[PDB]
């Protein structure tokens, strides 16, 4: 019914109303830790906080707080860490989380600067010879390689725990062609980017959850996980047409508030899961 509904909703013009309905029905759990006075500067927005139940804790004694949630989808058998776009003061925390949660990939869907606005801190080194050292979390990050394609860029970064000198390779998947405003006209490059992230094995049970982060203004980390989880479901269930994107989204929203930030992203999501289920069906 995916396309049937899409068409009805699109024809009747009820996207904002359908999106609003999800906002009203979405889970509401406490974010006590996120709201503590000491963590005011660790949050980009007071309106996007991690629920206490699913928040990612840093293994620091001082303050274990970071604005990030573990989204665990049982049926799809996929975990993701959804976090806000790093802040200038939270980059060491961000990588500390990447390190501690043993993540293999970091997924980014914004450019650091869009239309003259800073969307998130420059949290990774853009130059191989200029590595970054986060002294608060005692970690070093070095750009190792960088493969730049049309719609996206994959980078190999090296994360080093200066305490132990242990090093790890993190894949940075940077989708760079997301429009300044609105959602992409076509879910083509988005889906390709997703299939590429999947191919790296970064979403594999063998690693910690992939970290997908948001960006200032209207974030889009949610689309990536929603589309990805939906496809997994269509491919795993007997009846692929039994996959309810709205229900899946509500399920994810039980782990982090606000996933899918606008009606357009919800529509774009319907779209991407549709075309994508097409590929994974016709090709795969
Ligand atoms: Cl920022
Ligand atoms: Cl939008
Ligand atoms: Cl953000
Ligand atoms: Cl989101
Ligand atoms: Cl919302
Ligand atoms: Mg150079």
């Amino acid at each position: 019914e995916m396309e049937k509904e899409f068409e009805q909703i699109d024809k009747s013009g009820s996207w904002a109303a359908i999106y609003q309905d999800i906002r009203h029905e979405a889970s509401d759990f406490p974010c006590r830790v996120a709201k503590l006075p000491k963590n005011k500067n660790r949050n980009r927005y007071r309106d996007v906080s991690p629920f206490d139940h699913s928040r990612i804790k840093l293994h620091q004694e001082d303050n274990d707080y970071i604005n990030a949630s573990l989204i665990k989808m049982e049926e799809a058998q996929r975990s993701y860490i959804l976090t806000q776009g790093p802040l200038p003061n939270t980059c060491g925390h961000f990588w500390e989380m990447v390190w501690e949660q043993k993540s293999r990939g970091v997924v980014m869907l914004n450019r650091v600067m869009e239309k003259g606005s800073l969307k998130c801190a420059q949290y990774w080194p853009q130059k191989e010879e200029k590595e970054m050292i986060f002294e608060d979390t005692n970690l070093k990050l070095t750009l190792i390689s960088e493969d730049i394609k049309s719609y996206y860029t994959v980078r190999q970064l090296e994360l080093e725990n200066l305490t132990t000198q242990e090093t790890r390779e993190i894949l940075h998947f940077h989708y760079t062609t997301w429009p300044d405003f609105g959602v992409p006209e076509s879910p083509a490059s988005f889906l390709n980017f997703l299939f590429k992230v999947r191919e790296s094995g970064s979403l594999s049970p063998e690693h910690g959850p992939v970290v997908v982060h948001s960006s200032a203004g209207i974030g889009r980390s949610g689309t990536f996980c929603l589309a990805d989880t939906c496809l997994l479901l269509m491919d795993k269930r007997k009846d692929p047409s039994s996959v309810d994107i709205k229900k899946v989204l509500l399920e994810m929203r039980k782990f982090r508030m606000g996933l899918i930030q606008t009606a357009d992203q919800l529509r774009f999501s319907y779209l991407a899961v549709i075309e994508g289920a097409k590929f994974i069906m016709g090709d795969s």
Side-chain angles (χ1 to χ4, degrees), residues 1-10 12-284:
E1 187 219 73
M2 180 102 51
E3 309 185 64
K4 191 178 166 182
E5 208 205 311
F6 184 95
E7 284 294 88
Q8 176 250 274
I9 293 166
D10 218 11
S12 59
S14 63
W15 280 112
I18 289 288
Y19 177 64
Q20 189 70 2
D21 198 50
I22 294 159
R23 269 163 54 73
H24 289 321
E25 287 175 46
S27 301
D28 178 10
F29 297 104
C31 302
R32 205 180 316 302
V33 179
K35 295 298 175 178
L36 299 176
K38 58 191 289 198
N39 298 319
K40 275 197 159 49
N41 301 328
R42 292 185 173 209
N43 299 312
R44 179 176 304 282
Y45 298 129
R46 47 214 153 71
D47 48 304
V48 191
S49 324
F51 298 133
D52 297 310
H53 87 80
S54 62
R55 85 187 172 95
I56 297 295
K57 305 184 188 187
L58 304 174
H59 301 172
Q60 261 172 311
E61 284 151 351
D62 175 55
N63 190 342
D64 76 10
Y65 182 75
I66 180 175
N67 190 322
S69 318
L70 172 65
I71 284 59
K72 193 166 185 174
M73 303 303 278
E74 300 291 317
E75 226 200 307
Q77 288 165 309
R78 189 85 97 203
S79 280
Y80 319 78
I81 284 177
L82 279 284
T83 187
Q84 58 183 21
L87 292 167
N89 64 306
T90 58
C91 295
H93 302 147
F94 173 87
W95 288 109
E96 172 187 355
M97 170 177 80
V98 165
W99 181 274
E100 299 178 344
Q101 305 303 318
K102 300 182 160 65
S103 294
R104 160 72 171 151
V106 171
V107 177
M108 168 172 206
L109 294 133
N110 59 291
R111 272 166 288 110
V112 166
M113 237 241 219
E114 291 186 0
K115 281 265 196 164
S117 271
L118 298 184
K119 311 292 283 185
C120 65
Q122 181 51 59
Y123 61 96
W124 74 99
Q126 293 156 275
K127 287 177 172 179
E128 287 82 340
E129 70 277 6
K130 275 287 186 180
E131 74 268 29
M132 301 179 65
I133 296 170
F134 306 102
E135 319 196 358
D136 56 341
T137 53
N138 207 39
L139 294 164
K140 191 167 72 185
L141 182 66
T142 304
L143 167 57
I144 292 302
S145 68
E146 176 164 43
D147 178 314
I148 310 182
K149 301 196 192 182
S150 301
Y151 58 120
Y152 79 90
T153 293
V154 180
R155 315 189 172 73
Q156 283 177 296
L157 308 174
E158 178 166 297
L159 189 54
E160 187 185 329
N161 179 335
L162 303 170
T163 294
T164 69
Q165 296 219 255
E166 181 181 332
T167 61
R168 209 171 283 171
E169 161 173 301
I170 307 305
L171 298 173
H172 186 230
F173 281 98
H174 191 169
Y175 180 102
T176 55
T177 61
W178 192 289
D180 298 312
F181 305 114
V183 300
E185 293 279 53
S186 166
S189 36
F190 180 72
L191 282 157
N192 255 282
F193 174 72
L194 166 66
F195 294 132
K196 194 60 170 31
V197 178
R198 289 180 160 191
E199 279 169 49
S200 66
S202 297
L203 302 182
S204 162
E206 308 186 310
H207 307 284
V210 63
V211 174
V212 192
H213 72 75
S214 182
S215 40
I218 298 182
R220 31 241 184 184
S221 57
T223 52
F224 182 91
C225 307
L226 180 55
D228 178 54
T229 284
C230 279
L231 294 168
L232 282 165
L233 291 177
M234 292 174 99
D235 184 73
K236 181 187 170 184
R237 291 185 186 172
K238 178 97 178 308
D239 190 2
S241 285
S242 70
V243 174
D244 198 323
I245 290 211
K246 290 179 274 75
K247 199 242 287 178
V248 171
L249 179 49
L250 286 168
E251 179 58 48
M252 301 198 129
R253 274 178 170 232
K254 288 175 185 181
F255 302 95
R256 186 171 180 88
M257 57 176 75
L259 301 180
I260 301 309
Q261 304 188 15
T262 65
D264 295 339
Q265 290 186 357
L266 172 74
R267 174 182 192 285
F268 181 79
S269 291
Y270 263 64
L271 206 48
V273 170
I274 283 165
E275 289 310 330
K278 263 60 177 306
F279 289 19
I280 311 181
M281 230 304 99
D283 171 289
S284 179

